[PDB]
Ligand binder design. Sequence first.
Ligand SMILES: [Cl-]
Ligand SMILES: [Cl-]
Ligand SMILES: [Cl-]
Ligand SMILES: [Cl-]
Ligand SMILES: [Cl-]
Ligand SMILES: [Cl-]
Ligand SMILES: [Cl-]
Ligand code: NA
Length: 129
Amino acid sequence: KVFGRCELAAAMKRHGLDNYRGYSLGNWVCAAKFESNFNTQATNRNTDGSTDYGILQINSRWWCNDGRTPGSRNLCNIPCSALLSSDITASVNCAKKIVSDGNGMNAWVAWRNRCKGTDVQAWIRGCRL
Ligand SMILES: [Cl-]
Ligand SMILES: [Cl-]
Ligand SMILES: [Cl-]
Ligand SMILES: [Cl-]
Ligand SMILES: [Cl-]
Ligand SMILES: [Cl-]
Ligand SMILES: [Cl-]
Ligand code: NA
């Protein structure tokens, strides 16, 4: 599923991401924009052989099981395929664990490089929330 901007903001809010670990909704929408362009089915292979999955490009090295990432963990206790669903529940629940891991949203390199410190509220501007 490719979400609209405000559609994703509302879904993220419904699932409790707004201000989770102190990160406003716009931070989450911005991260999703640059990780996946709001496409739940986005995947990307990393140089190390791990794969990133879904709207927030969650990596198989630590967070999900895809059966083809040697020496990896599955800390969200889910198949990586669950991160590609039109229902963002699995992605949100796993993102909550990731953002709680110690480095906040810096876990998402694209957030650090493209969202951090910017006017992230623009991502939810106009949205009925
Ligand atoms: Cl957009
Ligand atoms: Cl915001
Ligand atoms: Cl594996
Ligand atoms: Cl594990
Ligand atoms: Cl699995
Ligand atoms: Cl959803
Ligand atoms: Cl933080
Ligand atoms: Na894994």
